[PDB]
């Protein structure tokens, strides 16, 4: 009975790295984007139903390993490629938390509930990162609507103080290239897109369009403000920046 928990704690830790178990095997069903795990029969049925509680942590971990594979396969130069670079960071710091648990089994011990309350701080972070990644999996977006999508989710989460901080680090690494190509428009009216990574696309006076494949920051009107600054160069709090940035370069 205390022995059947100990080796399954060790098997659970092996899965969470992303590596096949001794008694937990991994079967792809959707191509390992969500893993249909099967733990094989153990003599004690009590420890087997508790082990099942800890396997969806690993299903949500497969969601993020396909996120960082997904944007690389397309070779973007977009801010979606950089959204994944953050999820690789949250993925590097995760690994320290499993490896500690691993260290704790070597000498000294962790029972199943000793496992349970240490996993418990990060299965909640995983599930918020997993749902941003599955909503994004449609083979979209290019620059501006990636940003539009992540802002709505930050304005959703409002009042759970938890995801305000986690969505805070994601939305500023996503904005790290975006405010580059923003400046190029408000001080020179020039474009800097490898693809189309900036909402105001181009093709004097010039033939500007906007697309809703790159939806504006929250509001359509401030994207229209940047339409009107750049012509003149040719001859919550973030959309707010624009309205007075126009009107000091008018």
């Amino acid at each position: 009975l205390p022995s059947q928990e100990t080796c399954l704690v060790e098997d659970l830790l092996y899965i969470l790295i992303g590596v096949d178990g001794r008694y937990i095997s991994v079967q792809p069903l959707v191509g390992r984007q969500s893993r249909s795990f099967s733990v094989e029969q153990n003599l004690d049925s009590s420890v087997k139903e508790l082990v099942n509680r800890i396997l969806p942590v690993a299903t949500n971990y497969s969601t993020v390993t396909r996120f960082v594979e997904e944007n690389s396969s397309f070779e973007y130069g977009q801010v979606n490629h950089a959204l994944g670079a953050a999820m690789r960071t949250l993925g590097k710091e995760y690994m320290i938390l499993i490896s500690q648990l691993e260290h704790l089994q070597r000498q000294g011990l962790l029972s199943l509930q000793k496992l349970w309350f240490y996993i418990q701080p990060t299965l909640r972070t995983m599930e918020v990162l997993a749902s941003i990644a599955t909503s994004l999996n449609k083979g979209e977006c290019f620059g501006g609507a990636t940003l539009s999508l992540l802002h709505d989710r930050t304005f959703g989460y409002t009042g759970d103080s938890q995801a305000q901080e986690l969505c805070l680090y994601l939305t500023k690494a996503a904005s790290a290239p975006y405010f580059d190509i923003l400046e190029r428009w408000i001080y020179r009216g020039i474009i800097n897109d490898p693809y189309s990574e900036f909402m105001v696309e181009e093709h004097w006076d010039q033939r500007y369009t906007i697309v809703q494949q790159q939806i504006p920051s929250f509001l359509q009107k401030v994207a229209d403000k940047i339409l009107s600054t750049g012509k003149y160069l040719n001859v919550q709090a973030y959309v707010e920046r624009i309205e007075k940035a126009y009107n000091y370069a008018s």
Binding site: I96, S99, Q100, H103, L104
Partner: protein, 93 residues
């Protein structure tokens, strides 16, 4: 315990006794009610925090250098309870 902690006040404050008395009182109160570690023991977690600190500041060379220094500390085989020493130096960077 009682002596070492008083020594701490004396060197920093650069004053002897009957000068550091009130400070002593804060220190005694705050150390005693939380005497034993409130974290699970683990050398590796603290080390990683020190190297991330180097990377965040873009001091990559020193981050590698540090890795050599921790092996030197560990190897001598004199000080055990190493995590707490390291932990302290990281909090005060």
């Amino acid at each position: 315990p009682n002596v070492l902690l008083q020594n701490l006040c004396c060197r920093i404050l650069g004053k002897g006794e009957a000068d550091v008395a009130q400070q002593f009182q804060y220190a005694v109160r705050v150390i005693g009610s939380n005497f034993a570690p409130t974290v699970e023991r683990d050398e590796f977690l603290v080390t990683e925090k020190i190297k991330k600190e180097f990377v965040r500041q873009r001091r990559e060379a020193d981050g590698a250098l540090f890795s050599e220094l921790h092996r030197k500390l560990q190897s001598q085989g004199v000080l055990k309870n190493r995590w707490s020493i390291l932990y302290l130096l990281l909090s005060l960077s």
